[PDB]
Design a protein around this ligand. Structure first.
Ligand code: ZN
Lengths: 285, 1009, 173, 312, 173
């Protein structure tokens, strides 16, 4: 009854992303990314609900009736929706690392603040009662990480100190525990302090100058100059599909989502942005 | 009995600076009896000005204790500014009374039997006939020249309404009226066609109800605003005479007496036949007698509630007569179309429209025989009440401001929405009812398609009886819009804005005698659009390169004939429409379409002109700490140093405030009266606090007492005590005393500051939307905004280098052909400047122009140089906004604003540095990439601490981006220690002024595309 | 200089012997002008003791009783069980502020010891019995203000404003 | 008794541009409400407890069958109880320590009040320590060209929470206290999500006092509007009065009603109580009993957190 | 039966020794639970009287002082000076309330004679000077809360909590 079940998933950036926002200049960027309630990158619920519906209608038009009746009918706007995406939350963003006193040398690591993990816990404590995808091991690692609020936590016990994004000296402690990692690769997740993590991430965004060139003589047109912020490859967002309990939603869960791996999201796809691989949490840790 | 107050007004001669004790009541009266007193007009003189206890009560009437025959003149706010009048006076002793006879060119060709026609016709032309013989605005008191005489002459007849109301048994009143909320109503509007008249419905509905008084109590009865330079009052009085039936030659002694001063252009009150500009503010005060007219004679009723019921129904009586005459026009012209629709709803909804779309708070205080009379003459401190009644009145505004009851909330809509009793036009609501799109809250009665099958399918819903009337429906109503009944009145009023002469004249005629004038005529009126203002320099270049670039465009009605008669309220247009270029067009289809817009850019590039720039500029202003100056508080002198909330405990903030009024009032005297106040004032917590702290200055007070003997005594134990109780008030309370002459002096300068600001804006290419006078809302083109702001703040403070219509503008004054009228030098003027693309939703542009300004009045603080050290201010900022690029520029850099004559040329000279930087970038002397190379220099100049090392880092940045290596740019070094405090508010504002200099020119060149 | 003292209006006739004052000075804090009461004091945190009326200082912000200040000092039978203080004329939460304050004023207060042996839970009560104040004006409002039967032509006017304004708290013990 | 509402994401409550004391560079077509109406709340709980056999034409007749009396709306950030406060086109979120010394401040003189309110709304406000007004601008895309579709753009201005913030209401029932507890609900406007949970919580009620606070829109019977406005300061001390809409019925898909209301956060006096209870008649007497049962006339004293209705 | 007692917390250094029964039993009203100081009593009409600091009772509800509540009686050298009282835990209103109180307990508040010598120049004081928090935490925040440094370790937060919450009013002299 009324969101009787839900499925969490992760949003991986296979290429860069640009999911544009209210395109103003308050950060000397002409096309800033969609900001969150704290300044982090996020994906709005409409940009997921639209661009996954717009993908599936182009892929499975035999299922056009179901995708309409779950994700929102537009020719008949009377009827309600039964599927609802949350706002995607920045779970991890990769960052360049230079090792100091490590046994395994790395080149890049994932970075998170505790602020970003408080919202992940805020999701997971709220979808726990649906009893269908509990995965308490996932949020219990979040419990142990948020137990150390105020330090700088790594999850591979070899690092002990590093320079992140070539400008930020950090000093790590491990969990004094193994704590098997949430993410997919063999790459350390370095949960940072809430102060410095709004710099290491904010350095790890990609700010690109672009121009528009007159094809006739290879010189820039007047006014063709603007800045864009991309979100890098391998960035991991987190969001949960919430579904109500009609049987047209379970067929939508059955052979739609389980045939769904790569999704185009966001804008500027002719530049080749917004190719996104989705990893559900019902087949992983 | 009243309306004989001319002798109460002219209780003194207007040659008062050549009469009081030296420098040769010289004349009294030549068209009535001697002035009405047994003690009546004399006490009306002694309660009118603050000089009456500055130097004591009887020295105001003994007229020689510290006399002078070398005559200067001062400003009322700031007496560090000496003004000279010298040897010149209006002329020879045998032609001294020709100007008395030039009163009598109309006022004794018409019979003096009635007094409701004299007292109103004498008030308006009173200064205007005297200034043309050049008397140089002499002071009232020679010992203290800090009041112009008309501001004491118009005061001593204004508060004569209190004197002649205390002569039945006891009555008398103040009555202040404020509207509920201006700017949210003003913001409602979709075309600027609503925005202009919504400013007008504020003023004209408030103009209606104040004709009810002056046709029954005469003028000089509203202090605030003054009816001396009201542009509404030069159209209302212009049709009182035109109703009478005199020749139009005879009125040229009146009309072109008005014309060269008020309404300076050729667009007059009788060129377009209305006032152009809504001028009355939302906040007004009346000083009122206790009388009720029954025909030539007045009775009183004692109950206080005689006004606040019967004023507000006159405010209803306007809105009734506004909409019922508006029923007539769409009934008279019902076959024309778009008015078939407006006549249809006014036949439907006559339940909802009997309430006004704006309301007013009318607060009322009174006066009795107590506190003004003791046996039948004055008591001790009879002047302590008048400010306190103003403090009674404003406290009533201070109390009832905290509840704003919105004007939508007065309707009864429950049964109309519980049960479907809503009348509608067009589609029927699938959702019960549909929200209005131009107020935003109300239900709609117009439901219109956006498209689908546009012109065809609108007919079968009941909006069209043919095809050709849709073009008038599509004219003022864009498709897809849904309107409340209140905006559908306003969008009908925007089409015929001349229709409000019903409301504007107060129904001076009958209801049909007004409307039948413009039943006849069909003069089309243009309001400029947003693509008009953004493309001024399109029309400025089509004038210059006239037809040699216009041959492919001789079919596109841009170079065709200016067709009908069409002429606007906008003065740039109104003297450049007939150049060979029509300007009635809406250029969203010529060079702001996209089909034939690229082709028009194919025209401009072969002729090498500047493209249309898609950005206009909205400019709002504000008076900074106005009402507390009119309450007498010293916040606008020390704005941000001591705000109004610090008036709880002034006995710890006593440091600079007891320095402030001290050095002002001792600067207000002249000669031997200067020493008379400078030792009686200081002994308050200095000596033993009682009398004989100032008996020592009797030793030179005695040098005039046995001179021409008229004094009734040999003992002065009382004139060094009642002078002491006056400064017991204005030191132990930091307020300065509000007199009748206090409000008349400021409001006359407000009215002069009004009309000079109307001329300043269209010395540029500007347009006026709202102009209350202490408030402003105008829309300039994107170029001329900065030097406007530079010279608007220099005009509102009062400083000129440029000759206007006929007025000369001096330091702390203003001169119209001889007469130095004063100014408002210390009262700052905030600004909120939005650069806007023309395709913005304009409801919200008017939202974040008020909402930008109200947060700027509270949070924005900057370190300001006070006596060598850095104190902090809060006001006098000129906030810019490109779209989110917000920039805050202070305008003062000294507390107070002015303290000598050499200080005027540095008010808002911050943005002259901006202007001179803009002056040297567009030439190619300073490089363009100066502004972008700045953000490397900001992190050091911020972290720099003493400005000597900062001098190079500023000059390096100038030198590093310099195309020539000898061009030198002079930056003031006091622009360096300024840092901006903006706490707890989410917008991004830079914390030093040099970044805000840089971010100001990022906006302006960003405005020019 | 000047000083004042406090009187209260309970549901009890415990005001008979309070002070020996009628005017004291010549003008008053609370006024009598034809539209009800003026400059009427409200003091929170003091609850009444109906029988042998006193006011105990509680620790409650919304426990409030209203009173009136007129120039004098009680009986020369106090200074052991009352309170008194001299405030800078604006530490007073008094309804309907009309006259300009004197920048200073000395006022006494009928005080009661907390009586720290009872579980006191108060209760707010409203004034009733139009007669009760219609002759508390016989008790004090004419004793403290001779203006009764001389100025106010609308007696029931002040009766009804005393009905509507005044309501206070009681110890109920 | 107490039901916490935890928003999992930014919320939207479609206000129609009633209040706007704020700048971003926004120009947004839908301004949001800071504290929602109770018809949202009662409509959300009745969206849980709905049955097909409880479908009839009149909504509030059906809605009060589905539940008990719902009480007022405020904020608990796990450590505060923040309460709305309106000065007129302004809003604040304050704890009650700045409400205890508030009816002190109301009756005071000229400059003491401007000393009071301008520290209160401007230096003692916890609005912008909590609320991040977040513009969101959405579009529509034709599936056959992949561009913007013409004419379809909106700019909805949502309501985000900087730190964790929960809504606080009170309900008198105990049977529903389990089945409402722990429910993910479609709370709010454009398909946003919140979480309900139920804790039993002692609350004192029904204190008689002059100056109250309105924790919900006090409705006005829309018959004595002239009798109400003529002494406006007789019933409200400070606050804002506006014609509100009661919202949107689900089963019949129309707007509900429109009434003048004393908006929440307004400081009222006791004289509104006998005013409503002597300007009602048997139709609206039976109507407005239901409106307090869904929670409009919630009145809180500034002494302590003690609630009471008007007809209670 | 249980009795409690009020400890006012200003920056003032008049706290040296007033309490001997510091724990006495085992329960005291206020507490700290890893998120700030709980049950901080506001008292209106009282102010600090800096000279050998105590609480002057004035007659302005704007005047308020915050403090804590601990079990016991102070030093048994007083009750000639303190305002000992008993309340049903209902008329005193604190913040951060966690458990339903025992419906009746007694109170010991330091009280000051009114003694109007000059006008009480009331001032607001917000806690500043981290060093004063550092010496008062050793002074009282531990002599009562022996729990501290055993259960509570987020010490900088109970510093972070009083500097902007704990405020009081003063007499300037
Ligand atoms: Zn409308």
């Amino acid at each position: 009854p009324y969101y009787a079940f839900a499925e969490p998933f992760f949003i991986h950036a296979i290429t860069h992303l640009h999911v544009g926002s209210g395109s103003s200049v308050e950060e000397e960027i002409a096309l800033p990314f969609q900001r969150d309630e704290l300044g982090y990158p996020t994906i709005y619920a409409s940009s997921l609900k639209g661009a996954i519906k717009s993908f599936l209608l182009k892929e499975f038009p035999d299922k056009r009736d179901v995708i309409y009746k779950v994700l929102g009918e537009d020719e008949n706007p009377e009827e309600a929706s039964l599927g609802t995406f949350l706002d995607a939350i920045l779970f991890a963003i990769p960052s360049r690392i230079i090792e100091i006193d490590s046994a395994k040398p790395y080149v890049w690591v994932y970075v998170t603040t505790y602020e970003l993990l408080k919202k992940v816990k805020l999701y997971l404590d709220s979808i726990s009662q649906l009893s269908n995808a509990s995965f308490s091991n996932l949020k219990n690692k979040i419990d142990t990480i948020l137990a150390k609020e105020g330090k700088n936590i790594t999850l591979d016990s070899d690092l002990k100190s590093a320079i992140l994004n070539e400008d930020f000296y950090v000093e790590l402690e491990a969990l004094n525990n193994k704590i098997p990692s949430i993410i997919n690769a063999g790459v350390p997740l370095l949960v940072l302090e809430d102060s410095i993590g709004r710099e290491v991430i904010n350095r790890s965004l990609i700010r690109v100058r672009r121009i528009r060139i007159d094809r006739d003589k290879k010189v820039v047109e007047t006014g063709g100059l603007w800045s864009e912020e991309y979100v890098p490859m391998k960035t991991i967002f987190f969001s949960v599909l919430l579904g109500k309990e009609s049987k047209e939603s379970a067929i939508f869960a059955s052979c739609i989502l389980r045939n769904l791996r790569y999704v185009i999201l966001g804008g500027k796809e002719t530049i080749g942005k917004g190719i996104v691989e989705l990893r559900w949490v019902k087949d992983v840790i | 009995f009243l309306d004989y107050k001319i002798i109460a007004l002219l209780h003194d001669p207007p040659n008062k600076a050549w009469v009081i004790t030296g420098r040769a009541a010289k004349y009294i009266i030549n068209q009535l009896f001697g002035k009405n007193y047994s003690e009546k007009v004399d006490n009306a003189d002694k309660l009118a000005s603050s000089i009456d206890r500055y130097l004591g009560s009887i020295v105001y009437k003994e007229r020689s204790l510290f006399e002078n025959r070398s005559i200067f003149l001062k400003n009322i706010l700031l007496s560090n500014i000496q003004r000279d009048i010298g040897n010149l006076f209006p002329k020879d002793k045998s032609k001294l009374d020709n100007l008395i006879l030039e009163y009598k060119k109309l006022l004794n060709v018409i019979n003096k039997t009635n007094l409701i026609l004299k007292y109103q016709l004498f008030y308006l032309i009173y200064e205007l006939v005297w200034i043309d013989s050049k008397y140089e605005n002499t002071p009232s008191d020679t010992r203290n020249p800090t009041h112009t005489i008309f501001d004491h002459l118009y005061a001593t007849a204004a508060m004569m309404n209190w004197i002649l109301s205390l002569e039945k048994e006891a009555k008398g009143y103040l009555l202040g009226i404020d509207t509920i909320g201006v700017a949210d109503f003003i913001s409602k509007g979709r075309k600027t066609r609503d925005l202009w008249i919504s400013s007008y419905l504020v003023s004209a509905l408030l103009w209606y109800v104040i004709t009810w008084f002056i046709e029954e109590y005469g003028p000089d009865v509203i202090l605030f605003p003054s009816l001396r330079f009201n542009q509404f009052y030069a159209f209302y009085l212009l049709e009182k005479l035109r109703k009478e039936g005199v020749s139009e030659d005879v009125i040229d002694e009146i009309k072109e007496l008005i014309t060269k001063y008020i309404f300076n252009g050729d667009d007059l009150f009788e060129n377009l036949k209305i006032p152009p500009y809504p001028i009355i503010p939302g906040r007004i005060t009346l000083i009122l007698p206790g009388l009720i007219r029954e025909g030539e004679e007045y009775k009183k009723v004692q109950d206080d509630n005689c006004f606040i019921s019967k004023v507000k129904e006159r405010y209803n009586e306007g809105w009734r007569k506004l909409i019922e005459g508006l029923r007539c026009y769409s009934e008279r012209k019902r076959e024309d179309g778009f008015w078939n629709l407006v006549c249809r709803v006014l036949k439907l909804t006559e339940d909802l429209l009997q309430t006004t779309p704006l309301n007013i708070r009318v607060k009322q205080v009174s006066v009795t025989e107590d506190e003004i009379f003791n046996n039948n003459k004055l008591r001790s401190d009879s002047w302590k009440i008048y400010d306190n009644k103003y403090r009674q009145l404003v406290s009533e505004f201070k109390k009832s401001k905290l509840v704003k009851v919105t004007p939508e909330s007065r309707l009864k809509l429950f049964e109309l929405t519980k049960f479907d009793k809503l009348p509608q036009i067009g589609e029927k609501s699938k959702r019960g009812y549909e929200f209005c799109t131009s107020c935003g809250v109300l239900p709609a009665v117009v439901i219109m398609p956006k498209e689908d099958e546009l012109e065809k399918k609108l007919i079968d819903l009941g909006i069209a009886r043919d095809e050709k009337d849709v073009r008038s429906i599509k004219n003022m109503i864009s498709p897809g819009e849904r309107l409340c009944p209140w905006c559908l009145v306003k969008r009908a009023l925007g089409a015929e804005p001349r229709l409000m002469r019903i409301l504007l004249l107060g129904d001076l005629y009958s209801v049909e005698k007004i409307v039948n004038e413009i039943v006849s005529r069909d003069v089309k009126i243009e309001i400029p659009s947003t693509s008009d203002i953004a493309s001024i320099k399109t029309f400025e270049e089509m004038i210059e390169k006239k037809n040699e670039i216009c041959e492919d465009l001789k079919e596109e009605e841009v170079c065709e004939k200016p067709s009908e008669s069409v002429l606007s309220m906008w003065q740039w247009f109104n003297k450049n429409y007939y150049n060979g270029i029509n300007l009635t067009i809406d250029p969203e289809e010529y060079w702001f379409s996209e089909k034939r817009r690229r082709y028009y850019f194919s025209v401009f590039r072969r002729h090498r002109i500047t493209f249309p720039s898609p950005y206009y500029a909205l400019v709002r202003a504000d008076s900074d700490y106005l009402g507390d100056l009119l309450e007498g508080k010293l916040t606008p002198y020390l704005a941000g140093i001591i705000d109004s909330g610090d008036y709880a405990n002034i006995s710890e903030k006593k440091e600079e405030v007891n320095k402030l009024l001290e050095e002002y009032l001792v600067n207000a005297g002249s000669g031997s009266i200067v020493d008379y106040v400078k030792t009686v004032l200081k002994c308050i917590r200095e000596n033993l606090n009682k009398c004989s702290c100032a008996e020592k200055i009797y030793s030179n007070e005695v040098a005039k007492v046995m001179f021409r003997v008229n004094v009734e005594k040999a003992n002065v134990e009382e004139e060094v005590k009642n002078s002491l109780e006056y400064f017991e008030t204005i030191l132990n309370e930091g307020r300065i005393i509000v007199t009748p002459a206090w409000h008349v002096s400021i409001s006359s300068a407000l009215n002069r500051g009004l009309l000079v600001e109307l001329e300043l804006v269209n010395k540029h290419k500007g347009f006026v939307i709202y102009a209350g006078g202490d408030d402003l809302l105008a829309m300039l083109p994107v170029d001329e905004v900065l030097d406007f702001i530079k010279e608007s703040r220099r005009a509102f403070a009062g400083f000129g280098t440029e000759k206007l219509g006929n007025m000369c503008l001096e330091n702390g004054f203003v001169r119209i052909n001889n007469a130095y009228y004063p100014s408002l030098p210390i009262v700052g003027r905030s600004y909120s400047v939005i650069i806007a693309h023309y395709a913005d939703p304009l409801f919200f542009v008017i939202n974040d122009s008020y909402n930008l300004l109200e947060e700027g009045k509270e949070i924005i603080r900057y370190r300001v140089m006070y006596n060598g050290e850095y104190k902090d201010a809060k006001k006098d900022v000129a906030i810019f906004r490109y779209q989110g690029l917000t920039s805050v520029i202070p305008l003062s850099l000294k507390r107070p604003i002015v303290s000598s004559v050499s200080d005027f040329n540095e008010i808002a000279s911050i943005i002259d540095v901006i202007l001179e930087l803009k002056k040297r970038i567009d030439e190619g002397r300073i490089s363009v990439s100066l502004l972008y190379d700045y953000e490397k220099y900001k992190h050091l100049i911020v972290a720099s601490d003493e400005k000597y090392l900062t001098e190079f880092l500023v000059k390096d940045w100038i030198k590093r981006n310099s195309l020539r290596k000898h061009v030198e740019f002079t930056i003031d070094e006091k622009l360096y220690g300024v840092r901006l405090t903006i706490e707890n508010y989410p917008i991004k504002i830079p914390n030093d002024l040099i970044s805000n200099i840089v971010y100001t020119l990022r906006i302006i060149y960003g405005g020019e595309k | 200089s000047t000083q004042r003292e406090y009187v209260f209006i309970p549901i009890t006739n415990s005001i008979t012997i309070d002070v020996k004052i009628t005017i004291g000075g010549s003008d008053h804090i609370t006024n009598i002008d034809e539209r009800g009461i003026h400059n009427v004091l409200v003091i929170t945190g003091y609850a009444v003791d109906e029988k042998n009326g006193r006011l105990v200082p509680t620790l409650d912000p919304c426990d409030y009783v209203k009173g009136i200040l007129v120039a004098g000092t009680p009986q020369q039978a106090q200074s052991n069980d009352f309170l008194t203080l001299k405030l800078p004329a604006n530490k007073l939460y008094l309804i309907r502020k009309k006259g300009n304050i004197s920048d200073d004023l000395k006022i006494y207060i009928p005080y009661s010891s907390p009586d720290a042996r009872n579980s006191m839970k108060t209760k707010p009560v409203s004034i009733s019995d139009d007669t009760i104040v219609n002759n508390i004006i016989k008790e004090v409002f004419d004793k403290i203000y001779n203006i009764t039967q001389k100025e106010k032509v609308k007696i029931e006017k002040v009766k009804e404003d005393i009905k509507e304004l005044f309501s206070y708290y009681a110890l109920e013990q | 008794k107490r039901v916490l509402i935890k928003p999992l994401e930014p919320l939207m409550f479609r206000s129609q541009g009633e209040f706007e004391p704020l700048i971003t560079g926004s120009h947004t077509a839908a301004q949001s409400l800071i504290i929602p109406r109770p018809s949202t709340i009662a409509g959300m709980l009745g969206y849980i407890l709905f049955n097909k056999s409880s479908g009839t034409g009149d909504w509030l007749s059906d809605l009060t069958n589905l539940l008990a009396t719902i009480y007022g709306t405020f904020i608990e950030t796990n450590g505060e109880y923040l309460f709305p406060l309106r000065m007129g086109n302004h809003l604040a979120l304050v704890d009650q320590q700045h409400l205890i010394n508030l009816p002190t401040l109301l009756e005071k003189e000229y400059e003491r009040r401007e000393k009071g309110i301008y520290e209160l709304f401007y230096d003692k406000n916890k609005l912008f320590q909590i609320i991040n007004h977040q513009d969101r601008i959405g579009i529509s895309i034709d599936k056959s060209t992949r561009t913007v579709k013409e004419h379809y753009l909106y700019s909805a201005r949502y309501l985000a929470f900087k730190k964790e913030v929960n809504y606080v209401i009170f309900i008198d029932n105990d049977a529903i206290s389990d089945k409402i507890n722990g429910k993910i609900v479609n709370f709010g406007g454009e398909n946003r999500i919140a979480k309900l949970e139920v804790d039993d919580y002692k609350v004192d009620t029904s204190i008689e006092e002059e100056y109250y606070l309105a924790l919900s829109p006090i409705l006005i019977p829309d018959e004595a509007l002239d009798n109400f406005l003529d002494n406006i300061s007789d019933y409200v001390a400070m606050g804002k009065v506006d014609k509100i809409s009661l919202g949107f019925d689900i089963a019949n898909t129309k707007r509900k009603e429109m009434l003048t209301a004393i908006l929440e956060g307004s400081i009222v006096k006791r004289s509104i109580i006998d005013f409503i209870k002597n300007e009602i008649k048997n139709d609206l007497r039976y109507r407005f009993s239901k409106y307090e049962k869904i929670g409009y006339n919630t009145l809180m004293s500034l002494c302590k957190l003690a609630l009471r209705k008007i007809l209670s």
